[PDB]
Amino acid sequence: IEEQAKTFLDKFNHEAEDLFYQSSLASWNYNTNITEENVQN
């Protein structure tokens, strides 16, 4: 069960990093320029 848990964590990290980077970039864009479209994004 430890091996499959490690495999699941390895699979999760790759998918999590990209989405977190996208969300952080969206937040950075919103804070950089205050526009309603950036709010929606």
XYZ file of N, CA and C in Angstrom:
123
model
N 0.839 -1.191 0.000
C 0.000 0.000 0.000
C 0.880 1.249 0.000
N 2.072 1.132 0.590
C 3.005 2.254 0.590
C 3.472 2.583 -0.823
N 3.745 1.555 -1.630
C 4.227 1.781 -2.990
C 3.169 2.469 -3.845
N 1.920 2.004 -3.766
C 0.861 2.635 -4.547
C 0.548 4.034 -4.032
N 0.672 4.261 -2.723
C 0.517 5.613 -2.192
C 1.596 6.541 -2.732
N 2.842 6.062 -2.787
C 3.920 6.861 -3.357
C 3.671 7.143 -4.834
N 3.183 6.143 -5.570
C 2.857 6.349 -6.978
C 1.758 7.392 -7.140
N 0.735 7.335 -6.285
C -0.338 8.320 -6.332
C 0.184 9.719 -6.038
N 1.066 9.848 -5.045
C 1.645 11.154 -4.738
C 2.478 11.677 -5.903
N 3.256 10.796 -6.539
C 4.049 11.205 -7.693
C 3.156 11.678 -8.829
N 2.061 10.960 -9.083
C 1.118 11.392 -10.110
C 0.481 12.728 -9.747
N 0.163 12.926 -8.466
C -0.525 14.139 -8.043
C 0.368 15.369 -8.134
N 1.661 15.227 -7.827
C 2.547 16.391 -7.823
C 2.648 17.026 -9.206
N 2.797 16.198 -10.245
C 2.953 16.717 -11.600
C 1.731 17.516 -12.027
N 0.535 17.005 -11.738
C -0.684 17.717 -12.094
C -0.904 18.945 -11.222
N -0.472 18.900 -9.959
C -0.724 20.015 -9.055
C 0.160 21.211 -9.382
N 1.422 20.967 -9.747
C 2.351 22.079 -9.940
C 1.901 23.002 -11.067
N 1.464 22.429 -12.192
C 1.068 23.244 -13.337
C -0.152 24.100 -13.018
N -1.182 23.497 -12.422
C -2.388 24.248 -12.098
C -2.106 25.321 -11.055
N -1.258 25.015 -10.067
C -0.908 26.029 -9.080
C -0.149 27.182 -9.719
N 0.758 26.883 -10.653
C 1.464 27.954 -11.344
C 0.496 28.820 -12.136
N -0.478 28.197 -12.801
C -1.466 28.973 -13.545
C -2.281 29.870 -12.619
N -2.722 29.332 -11.480
C -3.509 30.129 -10.542
C -2.689 31.280 -9.968
N -1.429 31.016 -9.620
C -0.565 32.066 -9.096
C -0.308 33.140 -10.144
N -0.131 32.740 -11.404
C 0.044 33.720 -12.469
C -1.210 34.565 -12.651
N -2.388 33.944 -12.556
C -3.630 34.706 -12.653
C -3.748 35.715 -11.517
N -3.414 35.297 -10.294
C -3.453 36.220 -9.161
C -2.452 37.355 -9.340
N -1.253 37.035 -9.834
C -0.247 38.061 -10.078
C -0.720 39.056 -11.128
N -1.365 38.566 -12.187
C -1.894 39.464 -13.205
C -2.994 40.351 -12.637
N -3.866 39.786 -11.797
C -4.917 40.595 -11.188
C -4.331 41.688 -10.304
N -3.324 41.349 -9.498
C -2.735 42.347 -8.611
C -1.902 43.364 -9.380
N -1.326 42.960 -10.513
C -0.530 43.878 -11.319
C -1.407 44.948 -11.959
N -2.505 44.536 -12.587
C -3.435 45.451 -13.235
C -4.836 45.142 -12.733
N -5.473 46.129 -12.106
C -6.797 45.943 -11.523
C -7.861 46.150 -12.594
N -8.285 45.059 -13.229
C -9.354 45.086 -14.218
C -10.329 43.952 -13.935
N -11.603 44.188 -14.259
C -12.649 43.209 -13.983
C -12.443 41.904 -14.742
N -11.926 41.970 -15.972
C -11.617 40.747 -16.703
C -10.577 39.919 -15.961
N -9.562 40.578 -15.397
C -8.596 39.868 -14.569
C -9.250 39.298 -13.318
N -10.250 39.992 -12.768
C -10.992 39.447 -11.634
C -11.648 38.129 -12.023
N -12.313 38.111 -13.180
C -12.967 36.889 -13.637
C -11.952 35.778 -13.889
N -10.823 36.114 -14.518
C -9.807 35.105 -14.810
C -9.240 34.507 -13.527
